């Protein structure tokens, strides 16, 4: 919960390139005010369509990291490049557009459900597919059991809208937003264990053929990724397949053996 940063915003970049979902991270370096070395010299390239699965503690960087390919977090050295662009030449607009970001603190909205997924830049979609985008995070249904459907507000009292209906609901804003690039944390804390299903199979459809960086939490996540990257103290312990990775008997392995705990 500790306050970040202010990014200012100074929207310099004028570039609406179509991302095509190839990252770079180039020597990236996180220095804090107190002297804390968040991220010490980060380098990754990600090729379109690759998913890459962080692993580490909570402090490890993690999160840091996706902040600052979203312009959440400043860089204190280094660059990051989208399809070879430099970030910040992109304009900020287009750049958080052909980027979706899902975690559990995704902000829902005492809205209707259509405005709750029909978001922001996606305000004016077609109404055929904000369904699809229903149906897709398993919501669809739910939502036509809600008093007025898909007029039903938010935040009123009597809803009956559980932890991972709620949760559905804001998975099929960034499922309609249909990014390139997908950064994932694929938490389903807290959540029964019918949405829990749901959820994993939409995240699972989600980072199909998409560039994706998720924060995992699910063996299946881990091992299927075309990249695994582990983290500690914001340094690159290892990184490569699983089967490099397990390898190597090392820092992994481990971590496998101990079911990723802590990490």
């Not at 970001?101 to 996606?122: D, P």
């Not at 007029?151 to 937003?177: E, F, H, M, P, Y």
């Not at 299927?224 to 390898?247: F, K, P, S, Y």
Request: net charge negative.
């Amino acid at each position: 919960f500790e306050l970040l940063d202010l990014p200012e915003e100074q929207n310099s970049g004028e570039l609406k390139p179509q991302l095509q979902g190839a990252i770079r991270f180039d020597h990236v370096v996180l220095n804090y005010a107190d002297g804390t070395q968040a991220i010490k010299d980060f380098s990754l390239d990600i090729r379109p369509g690759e998913t890459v699965a962080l692993v580490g503690r909570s402090g490890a960087g993690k999160t840091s990291l996706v902040n600052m390919l979203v312009r959440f977090q400043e860089v204190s050295s280094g660059q990051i490049y989208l399809d070879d662009l430099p970030i910040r030449d992109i304009e900020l607009s287009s750049l958080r557009t052909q980027i979706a970001m899902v975690n559990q603190q995704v902000v829902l909205f005492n809205r209707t459900v259509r405005e709750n997924i029909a978001y922001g830049q996606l305000h004016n979609a077609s109404d055929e597919d904000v369904i699809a985008a229903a149906k897709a995070a398993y919501a669809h249904d739910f939502i036509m059991n809600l008093p007025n459907g898909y007029d039903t507000v938010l935040g009123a009292q009597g809803l009956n809208l559980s932890g991972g209906q709620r949760q559905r609901i804001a998975i099929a804003r960034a499922i309609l937003k249909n990014a390139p690039i997908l950064i994932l944390d694929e938490a389903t804390s807290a959540l029964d264990n019918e949405s829990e299903h749901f959820i994993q199979q939409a995240f699972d459809e989600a980072m199909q053929d998409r560039t994706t960086i998720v924060i995992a939490h699910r063996l299946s996540t881990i091992e299927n990724a075309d990249r695994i990257v582990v983290m500690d103290r914001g340094q690159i312990v290892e990184q490569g397949t699983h089967q490099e990775l397990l390898a190597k008997h090392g820092a992994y392995y481990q971590l496998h053996q101990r079911n990723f705990e802590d990490h």
